């Protein structure tokens, strides 16, 4: 019917007038490219040659453009079409003597994109305004859009094969407007929550804390190599922190060159280290776990998510307010380049080694598990005698279920705390958690110590069968394993019940992810 065609999605208003498909567009897979600036994007030659931009001929650019017409279309940096002031559009493939087609002021020439045109780059579903931003193209080999790794965060891209959409504006008015407003350097601090919407991430994030540690010393030869990558270097090599026996630069020192000699952050330091609330103030071993920046020089302390990351009070945020977006943009590219290259001599890895611990730790953990399991039997024995005495705000069943959950959670937390402590300094796993790169304390707990009580809908595994969770258990067994506690860890394998119970809890995460995308998509739409 006519009404139906008009109705909703794919209807004349919403699915067509309000949102139509457009011309001048490109779409491909993305891969990471440290070597680009932030507001650059790499574009495949095929995509750059097929798409076009209309330059209008002036007296002082005519000679270059005439050369461009002469290159034709068969080679890359050419022209597609020439448009006469009369209104005629002319193809530049069929005409046998382009040289005979003399240009003059007032003709428009539709040339292939080249290194420096501005595009709108976009990843749907477009969640917030920073999800669609203007970039400079950079033409290079092989067929994906290549974009600086730090831009992943506003976009939510995970080069696990995510797509991007690219759009090329056509007039000078839309190019100026994009260049002034939509550009990525303008997008750095978000108006949503007045914080930097993009921080240093992944390897660069791990490699930097490791680099800023005061144990790192570099020879004159390796300092030159890092200095070589830096863009805004002054040309003066800084006075080495150690003059003799042999000349050496500290990690923090070379880092002081990559920040704009002006930013003045104090505090932001909060790694786990040092202490919680008052330990460093006992005696003032001015310490090394707390970061200090003065006069644009990193004075003491290593970097992490707390200093370097998206946190509203960072090096990147303070620099943005202080130096201004263009200087913050050279600072982002530079920090990655000096820090990726140093990582290049250093390396970073993670084997099974980072997940295994010592014999004493396992005996202690197992002894911790044996105590918790005995206590659960103790609660059950107390419960069957009808002497448990309900808590003032629950029923007897609820008190029992609260109480065993308190103990089994308490058990995981004790063994979890025990493994993080038993680990050493060299565990690459600790290096990824501590920098704030990926993972968390609870992740470490799960691979090495113990996985714990699986859950569904906010409580322990349900009695799917009559008074049992799996046919393997005895009826009415309220102990730990039977109601879905996983006693082992992902380093030591799981038992069949644990594997199946783990599988129940992993699923609840898949259903939540599928539903959530729809309702948020709808709630957002109603608001705008």
């Amino acid at each position: 019917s006519l009404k139906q065609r008009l109705k909703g999605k794919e209807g004349r208003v919403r699915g067509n007038l309000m949102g139509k498909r457009v011309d001048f567009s490109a779409r491909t897979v993305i891969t990471p490219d440290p070597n680009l600036s932030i507001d650059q994007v790499g574009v495949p030659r095929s995509i750059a040659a097929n798409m076009t931009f209309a330059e209008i001929v002036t007296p002082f650019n005519i000679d270059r453009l005439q050369e461009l017409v002469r290159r034709g279309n068969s080679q890359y940096p050419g022209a597609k079409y020439i448009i006469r002031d009369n209104g005629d559009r002319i193809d530049l493939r069929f005409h046998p003597k382009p040289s005979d087609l003399h240009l003059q002021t007032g003709y428009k020439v539709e040339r292939h994109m080249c290194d420096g045109d501005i595009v709108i780059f976009n990843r749907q579903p477009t969640l917030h305004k920073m999800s669609m931003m203007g970039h400079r193209v950079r033409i290079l080999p092989w067929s994906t859009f290549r974009l600086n790794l730090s831009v992943t965060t506003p976009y939510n891209a995970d080069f696990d094969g995510d797509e991007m959409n690219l759009h090329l504006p056509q007039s000078l008015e839309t190019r100026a407007e994009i260049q002034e407003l939509a550009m990525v350097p303008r997008m750095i601090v978000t108006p949503q929550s007045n914080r930097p919407v993009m921080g240093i991430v992944q390897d660069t994030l791990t490699a930097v804390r490791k680099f800023t540690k005061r144990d790192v010393f570099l020879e004159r030869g390796e300092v030159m190599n890092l200095l070589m990558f830096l863009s805004t270097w002054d040309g003066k090599v800084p006075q080495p922190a150690i003059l003799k026996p042999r000349p050496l630069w500290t990690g923090k020192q070379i880092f002081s060159l990559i920040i704009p000699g002006h930013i003045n952050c104090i505090r932001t330091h909060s790694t786990h280290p040092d202490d919680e609330d008052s330990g460093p103030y006992k005696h003032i071993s001015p310490g090394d776990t707390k970061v200090v920046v003065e006069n644009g020089e990193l004075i003491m302390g290593i970097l992490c998510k707390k200093s370097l990351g998206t946190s509203a009070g960072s090096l990147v945020h303070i620099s943005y307010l202080e130096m201004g977006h263009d200087i913050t943009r050279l600072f982002y590219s530079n920090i990655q380049t000096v820090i990726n290259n140093w990582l290049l001599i250093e390396g970073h890895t993670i084997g099974i080694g980072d997940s295994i611990a010592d014999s004493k730790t396992y005996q202690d953990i197992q002894n911790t598990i044996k105590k918790a399991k005995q206590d659960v039997i103790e609660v059950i024995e107390k419960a069957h005698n009808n002497e448990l005495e309900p808590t003032p705000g629950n029923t007897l069943r609820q008190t029992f279920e609260n109480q065993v959950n308190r103990i089994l959670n308490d058990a995981r937390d004790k063994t979890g705390s025990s493994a993080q402590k038993s680990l050493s300094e060299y565990n690459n796993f600790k290096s990824m958690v501590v920098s704030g790169a990926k993972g968390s304390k609870i992740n470490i707990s799960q691979v090495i110590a113990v996985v714990g009580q699986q859950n569904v809908e906010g409580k322990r595994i349900p009695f799917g069968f009559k008074h049992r969770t799996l046919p393997h258990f005895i009826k009415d067994d309220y102990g730990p394993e039977s109601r879905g506690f996983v006693e082992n860890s992902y380093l030591a394998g799981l038992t069949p019940t644990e594997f199946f119970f783990h599988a129940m809890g992993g699923r609840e995460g898949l259903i939540d992810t599928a539903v959530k995308t729809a309702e948020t998509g709808y709630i957002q739409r109603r608001l705008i």
Partner: protein, 275 residues
Amino acid sequence: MPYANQPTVRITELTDENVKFIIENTDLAVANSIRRVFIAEVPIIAIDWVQIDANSSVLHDEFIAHRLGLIPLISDDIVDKLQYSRDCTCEEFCPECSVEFTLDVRCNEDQTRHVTSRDLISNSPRVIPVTSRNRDNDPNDYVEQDDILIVKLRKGQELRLRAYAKKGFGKEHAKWNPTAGVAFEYDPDNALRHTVYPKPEEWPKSEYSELDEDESQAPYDPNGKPERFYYNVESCGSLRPETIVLSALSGLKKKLSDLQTQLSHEIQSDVLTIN
């Protein structure tokens, strides 16, 4: 120039396939680059152009062209007589910048036939054949010494094609590799701490770490530098090991010399702040 560090050599072991040696009093960058040259820059001859007349095997066409590319070629003859295809005055190919190979086989018998390098012949005189059964089977028999099963055929199936081998090198395509591999090691006791061992006792001592035989594991030295590099190049069979290394060194010498001549040409005209 006063700073040139002599650079001595010592050869430990040499066979038909291996060359094991130590270079001493030279720089790490020389060691790494000479190694990079052994893989990428050593020229060789390999099949590069294949045209297929009739192909009825149970394997598709490009699959055959690919397998042919990868077979090694006895380039014992100085590949320098054979110029690069790009430079030669000839249209497309010629005897002076190419070698020609030809293959024609069919399975007339009821049993399965194997296709191998012995059936593939150089139209070009016998000085540049495939690696299998030429200068000798080496009393060390490789039962069939078939080099490679190119494909298999049955009654009625046939394969007729032509191939043109040319000079090219490793940093272009992997087929142009003179090496099956190359071992490279320096400072096997970690005296310099260029790598940092947590729990140093769990590492197995290397073949050259035997000096102090001591289980003490790595004596430190803070005033050290790299010295004494251990190599072990192994040939793929396409060229004798010492001849690969000598060709690499000289080719690299031609390459730097070219950079000097370009650099001199730059200062042939305007002085360009030469002094």
